[PDB]
Each structure stands twice: as C-alpha cells, then as structure tokens.
Amino acid sequence: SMQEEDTFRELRIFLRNVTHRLAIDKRFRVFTKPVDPDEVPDYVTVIKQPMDLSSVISKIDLHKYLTVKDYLRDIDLICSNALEYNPDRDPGDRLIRHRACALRDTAYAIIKEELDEDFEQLCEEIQESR
Ligand SMILES: CC(=O)c1[nH]/c(=N/C(=O)[C@H]2CNCCN2CCC2CCC(F)(F)CC2)sc1-c1cncc(N)c1
C-alpha cells in the first residue's frame, strides 16, 4: 500500500545514513569499493561472493533491502569475506581482520542504538506478507 511504501522508504533513508557513516570512516576504506583484479588477482579464487559498501549503496537504491536483517546479512558478508581472505598471522592480515570486526561491530551498534525494534518488526511483517 501507500503506508507500506512509506515504511520501506524510511528504511532506505535509514540504511543510506548508516552506510555513509561506515563509508567515511578511515578504518573502513578497504571495504568501500570492489576488489580490483589487477591489484589482487587471487581474490576471486578465495571469495565466491564479493561484497563492499559501494555495492550495498547500489542495492539500497535498487530496493533490494526490505528489512534490516537483509542489510545486516551483507554487512556480515563483508566481514566474513575479509576474515576468510586474511587468515594469516601477517600484520597486514591481522589489521584487515581487526577493521572487518570493527566494521561489523559498528554497524550492529548503530542499528541497536538508533533503529526502533517495532519499525524493524513492521518491515518484517510487510515482507512476510509478500
Ligand atoms: C577486500 C579484502 O579483504 C582485501 N584483503 C586484502 N588482503 C591483503 O592484501 C593482504 C594479503 N596478505 C598480506 C597482507 N595484505 C594486506 C596488506 C595491507 C593491509 C592494510 C590495508 F589498508 F588493508 C592495505 C593492505 S586486500 C583486499 C582488498 C584489495 N584490493 C581492494 C580492496 N578494496 C580490498
């Protein structure tokens, strides 16, 4: 309905604001754009389902997220991809893993503090009804 499309619009507005706050954080710059095959060639050998914050923005605008759970699944994918591609004790690996976990923890903390749980429930019930 009209009421339901207004609900999903507010969700998109909220998700755009969270994603922008993540994307401008210096720690998360490595997660802001897809991985250039020129710069690292073996990424596709390890990571079957790439994800990054620019792609999250595009998915928001394509109405791909109808719940915050759907969005958080892509945030979690960014993080688990980073952990999987950087398993070594190497300090470069450990640094990216630390930033990956910080990215995930920061997104969950913002949503826990700022997203009303009745709003997320409404989104879920609209989605369940389709
Ligand atoms: C998406 C992802 O997880 C990813 N992981 C990578 N891991 C590495 O490059 C590991 C490999 N082992 C040795 C150490 N090295 C890391 C060194 C050094 C750490 C600080 C730094 F700022 F991160 C820059 C890299 S590169 C990479 C990626 C690549 N091209 C574009 C994008 N957007 C992300």
From Swiss-Prot:
Looking at the record, the residues that make up the Bromo domain are 3-114
Could you tell me what induces this protein?
Up-regulated in breast, uterus, colon, ovary, and stomach tumors. Induced in breast cancer cells overexpressing NCOA3 or treated with estrogen. Down-regulated in 5-fluorouracil-resistant derivatives of the colon cancer cell line HCT 116.
Question: Where does this polypeptide localize?
Answer: Nucleus
Q: Which residues form the signal peptide?
A: none
Domain of life, per lineage = Eukaryota
The residues forming a coiled coil are: 108-130
Tissue and organ expression note: Highly expressed in estrogen receptor positive breast tumors and in osteosarcoma tumors.
Summarize the protein's role. Answer: May be a transcriptional coactivator of the nuclear receptor ESR1 required to induce the expression of a subset of estradiol target genes, such as CCND1, MYC and E2F1. May play a role in the recruitment or occupancy of CREBBP at some ESR1 target gene promoters. May be required for histone hyperacetylation. Involved in the estrogen-induced cell proliferation and cell cycle progression of breast cancer cells.
* Quaternary assembly: Interacts with ESR1 and NCOA3 and these interactions are enhanced by estradiol. Interacts with acetylated lysine residues on histone H1.4, H2A, H2B and H3 (in vitro).
Q: Which family does it belong to?
A: Belongs to the AAA ATPase family.
What protein is this chain from? ATPase family AAA domain-containing protein 2
Q: Record the organism.
A: Homo sapiens
Underlying gene: ATAD2
Shown residues in whole-protein numbering: 981 to 1108 of 1390
